[PDB]
Amino acid sequence: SQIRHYKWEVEYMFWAPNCNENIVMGINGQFPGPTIRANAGDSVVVELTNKLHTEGVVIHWHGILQRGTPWADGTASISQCAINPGETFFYNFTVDNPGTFFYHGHLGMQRSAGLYGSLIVDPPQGKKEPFHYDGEINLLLSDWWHQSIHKQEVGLSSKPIRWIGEPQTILLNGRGQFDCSIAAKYDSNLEPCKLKGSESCAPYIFHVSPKKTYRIRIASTTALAALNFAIGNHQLLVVEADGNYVQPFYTSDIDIYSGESYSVLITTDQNPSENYWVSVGTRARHPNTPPGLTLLNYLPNSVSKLPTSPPPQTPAWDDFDRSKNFTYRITAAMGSPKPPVKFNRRIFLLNTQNVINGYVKWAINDVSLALPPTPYLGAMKYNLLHAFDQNPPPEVFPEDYDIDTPPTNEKTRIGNGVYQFKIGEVVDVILQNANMMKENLSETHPWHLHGHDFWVLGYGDGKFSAEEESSLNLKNPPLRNTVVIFPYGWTAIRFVADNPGVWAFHCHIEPHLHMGMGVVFAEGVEKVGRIPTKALACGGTAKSLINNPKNP
Amino acid sequence: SQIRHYKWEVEYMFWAPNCNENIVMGINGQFPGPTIRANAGDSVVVELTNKLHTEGVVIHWHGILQRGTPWADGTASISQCAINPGETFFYNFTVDNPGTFFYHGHLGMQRSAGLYGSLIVDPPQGKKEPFHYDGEINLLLSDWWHQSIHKQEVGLSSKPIRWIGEPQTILLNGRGQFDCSIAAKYDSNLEPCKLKGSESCAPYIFHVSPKKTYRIRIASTTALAALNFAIGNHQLLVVEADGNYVQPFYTSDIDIYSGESYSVLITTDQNPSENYWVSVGTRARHPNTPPGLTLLNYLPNSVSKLPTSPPPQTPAWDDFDRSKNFTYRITAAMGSPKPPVKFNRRIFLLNTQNVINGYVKWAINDVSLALPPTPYLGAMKYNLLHAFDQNPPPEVFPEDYDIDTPPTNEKTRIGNGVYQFKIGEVVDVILQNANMMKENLSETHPWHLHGHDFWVLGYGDGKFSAEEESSLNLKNPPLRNTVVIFPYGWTAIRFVADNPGVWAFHCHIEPHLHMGMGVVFAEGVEKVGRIPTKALACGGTAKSLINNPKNP
Ligand SMILES: *[C@@H]1O[C@H](CO)[C@@H](O)[C@H](O)[C@H]1NC(C)=O
Ligand SMILES: *[C@@H]1O[C@H](CO)[C@@H](O)[C@H](O)[C@H]1NC(C)=O
Numbered sequence A, B: 001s002q003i004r005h006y007k008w009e010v011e012y013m014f015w016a017p018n019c020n021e022n023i024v025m026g027i028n029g030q031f032p033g034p035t036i037r038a039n040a041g042d043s044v045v046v047e048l049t050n051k052l053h054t055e056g057v058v059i060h061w062h063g064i065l066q067r068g069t070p071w072a073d074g075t076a077s078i079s080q081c082a083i084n085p086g087e088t089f090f091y092n093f094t095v096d097n098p099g100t101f102f103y104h105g106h107l108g109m110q111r112s113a114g115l116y117g118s119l120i121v122d123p124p125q126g127k128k129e130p131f132h133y134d135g136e137i138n139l140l141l142s143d144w145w146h147q148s149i150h151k152q153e154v155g156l157s158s159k160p161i162r163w164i165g166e167p168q169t170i171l172l173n174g175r176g177q178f179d180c181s182i183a184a185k186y187d188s189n190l191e192p193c194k195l196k197g198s199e200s201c202a203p204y205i206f207h208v209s210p211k212k213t214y215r216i217r218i219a220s221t222t223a224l225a226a227l228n229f230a231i232g233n234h235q236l237l238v239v240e241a242d243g244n245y246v247q248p249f250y251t252s253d254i255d256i257y258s259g260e261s262y263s264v265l266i267t268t269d270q271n272p273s274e275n276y277w278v279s280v281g282t283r284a285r286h287p288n289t290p291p292g293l294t295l296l297n298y299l300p301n302s303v304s305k306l307p308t309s310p311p312p313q314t315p316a317w318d319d320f321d322r323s324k325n326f327t328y329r330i331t332a333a334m335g336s337p338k339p340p341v342k343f344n345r346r347i348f349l350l351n352t353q354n355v356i357n358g359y360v361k362w363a364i365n366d367v368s369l370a371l372p373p374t375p376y377l378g379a380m381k382y383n384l385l386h387a388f389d390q391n392p393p394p395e396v397f398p399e400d401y402d403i404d405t406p407p408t409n410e411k412t413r414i415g416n417g418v419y420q421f422k423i424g425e426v427v428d429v430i431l432q433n434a435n436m437m438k439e440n441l442s443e444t445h446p447w448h449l450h451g452h453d454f455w456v457l458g459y460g461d462g463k464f465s466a467e468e469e470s471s472l473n474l475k476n477p478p479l480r481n482t483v484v485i486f487p488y489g490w491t492a493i494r495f496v497a498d499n500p501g502v503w504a505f506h507c508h509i510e511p512h513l514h515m516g517m518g519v520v521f522a523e524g525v526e527k528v529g530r531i532p533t534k535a536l537a538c539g540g541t542a543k544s545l546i547n548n549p550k551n552p
């Protein structure tokens, strides 16, 4: 096991992801950030210096469990006080299992500004993958707005709310094209990009040699978009999802939601004298963004040899039945960990869009989360009972609530209480979607849990009932860290509370989390060790722990 | 009989149709143009002074037959030379029959710049309309872009073509809203408009008293948009179409393509305590323009009192079955003229989108029209045989043409020949639609005939074949001046060549006309009287009528 040490500085910089200049959050002058790669069992040490001028910053490592290091999860106001400008913090954690993971900002809307990058973990040294491939292609997907993140943030906190709107560009490994298309030759209504290939927004071309097999790693850190990935004329075999192996299956395209990572295998068994289109299109929302595009370049063909066909036409955004058909097919690889068969706690969380005091907010069982200035982990380790609400948040919603109609907003409150588990509890969480404030509208929401992987027991339509208990999959369910709820549907997940610390569980769409859509889960904090002083040095924790008497 | 004299000047002026300032082509300082209202049989005299600085102008009176006056049609290079800066021209014509008509620019792309308005002809003095209503409302629909007309024109003449795109705003009597919605109440994602009612872009509200019946006259002069008109909670009785009367029928909404006019009657039956939305949405093209909205305000309710329902959701743009369902119903009112049972001439016109010398053009039987600098009416009266191509244009296309494939463009050319008819021929025209340059695309095209009305004999899918004859409606076909071809279909029309002149027959979508999509018909030209000198004063007609010898 090696220690992988990184030394990084976060600073803003001018950059043009789609050849339109804006400011991006770079790490060591790079956008996207540097890739962390390690082997399972290695320690990763990142010393991060904050060089933003007035802003705090944190980095969350998505999918890493932080077992023994919950202070290193990178969630402002939950695991730590943010890092102040000019300060250096050490995140030191272990990577336990192989997978495609990534990292991102977890304070304000910092990840939409560009703070993200890949974190890949290979098998233990000497050990190999369950599947053979000759090469690897890594792809991080994100979306880009031309509006400032500070104007977006304020617009989302105003009465009337100013929605951020659909993204201007989809970014593939940080690059995309705006107001022109590299596929303009198939449609004269499109403007041709003039690009010699050297520009910041020039496509990241995938170069493959014929008759080989390639592992394509795909992760999504979109703030809003749900995307569909397809390569013209090539079958994808799904082999990994969220750092866990799935039972393999072929599909023509995959749907990927913010927070998910997949590894797909392809084989370059097609006509070797041509190049092929890679298309990443928007779904689950009425599209107003051009697809992200690049080429699968079979060497030695010039990359300027455009494909004979147009890019694959993206599946209709609202064919939720097609989407369920993909999603429901995901099962754990033969020989995976199977769930506990009985649960000790089952919690029901209704997802609504609400209007609390003029403001449009999202609520979970009528509580919109507002995070305190004291970090929950330090607050619970030093038993600071006034830092947040000690009263237990609701574990159920009313059986007379009608999920087919708008909220009344009669009892909708902002809050910051925490759900608490006993170390070793098996917990089921039934996520219930509902109609939003507009009539006859419900959307898809990706939910992500920190510090754990859970089994996805099932999905269904309408309101979950006792009649649905027997449909839950306890034989083969996949282990994941992100899961979707479909329009007016439910999703049931199970996990064991075996990881001392305070863990966020929230919709991974960034404006939704900003508007309150998430909860806080705490378990076994009595067993948490020493927290680094920098993670304690703010709020109520700095107040009790800094000894600064008066008259003494 | 009465002479209606108008003193008019056209000048560009600053104006903000959607509250974003640009320049608009106004008549006598107003946008839209002044309405003409006369009674059938009167004579309209318009003395137009061109107050543009470097540009010529012409005004076409849409749907007036120009019976006796072919020189007053207002088509530059067909009926007349354009009117020069500083000069006054007189358009004198008879309005023969009652109905909803309008006028517009017919030089370059001048109508998209705002040169258009209403021409309404009431029954002969003393007569009544065949139906009763207590009031009437006049609506003229058009569309609006934020880019300059002249930058658009250069974009459509460039290699590679820069397409104009979807309109920014749909205008209802010259007003519309951009980036905000007057119906933002129903959706948090929409921005509210901060309008007082006094602004240039504030909606023209429809004021009505309960329990009355009204005639809503609706005309379209859009450059591109096919629109769908609907009123919340109010069924429409269709009673007039293109100045003629149709067999009355009820509908919840009507489709209207560029160049058509309709009259619909409504009765204010609904609950008198509230207001209803009028919504005009985009169809036939993938929408990216918000609906044009206004209120049907039941007096004395406050106009600020929003309806209880959202606006009616426009039917899906691509549900062409629904469109055909509406279109195929229109039949002539009993008492109307029936067609000649036998025709003397049948012409087949294939509509293609092509690339001629790198330029994306539109062509009819492979000729893309480019108009000459000599007006066809002057050239033909004075028998100037070198002014245009005297070869008859193609009257049929190859029966082996695959209308499901992009054109090859092998023989597609630009030309300016004329189809000539004998004074009194019954002419049949089958307009055939086909696949465009993009694979699997065919669009709807509204075709308009000048100087005539025709009977719509029928519509069909695919390619026309002679075995299609038994479906043609020789019994009840409506009389119209504009008619659509649906994607991949044909439409057959019949008219009589009885009105001496040179008449344009083109697709009424302004960009397509700019790109060559139209033909020219001339009949009985040796029966034309004296043409105005200003209409002759350019090109070949000037050169040959100005006696200016040399040595002298
Ligand atoms: C993190 O790792 C560095 C480098 O080994 C070390 O100096 C530092 O004290 C560690 N801090 C924690 C909290 O483990
Ligand atoms: C048009 O009518 C006006 C008013 O009667 C007259 O002065 C003018 O000469 C007429 N011109 C033509 C071409 O008829």
Ligand SMILES: [Cu+2]
Pocket: A062, A104, A259, A448, A508
């Ligand atoms: Cu994440």
Ligand SMILES: [Cu+2]
Pocket: A060, A061, A062, A063, A448, A449, A450, A451
């Ligand atoms: Cu995470």
Ligand SMILES: [Cu+2]
Pocket: A286, A287, B286, B287
């Ligand atoms: Cu759309």
Ligand SMILES: [Cu+2]
Pocket: A444, A445, A446, A507, A508, A509, A512, A517
């Ligand atoms: Cu969400």
Ligand SMILES: [Cu+2]
Pocket: A060, A106, A448, A450, A504, A506
């Ligand atoms: Cu998170």
Ligand SMILES: [Cu+2]
Pocket: B062, B104, B259, B448, B508
């Ligand atoms: Cu017209």
Ligand SMILES: [Cu+2]
Pocket: B060, B061, B062, B063, B448, B449, B450
């Ligand atoms: Cu006309």
Ligand SMILES: [Cu+2]
Pocket: B444, B445, B446, B507, B508, B509, B512, B517
């Ligand atoms: Cu057309």
Ligand SMILES: [Cu+2]
Pocket: B060, B106, B448, B450, B504, B506
């Ligand atoms: Cu015309």
Ligand SMILES: [O-]
Pocket: A061, A062, A063, A064, A449, A450, A451, A481
């Ligand atoms: O995570």
Ligand SMILES: [O-]
Pocket: B061, B062, B063, B064, B449, B450, B451, B481
């Ligand atoms: O006309």
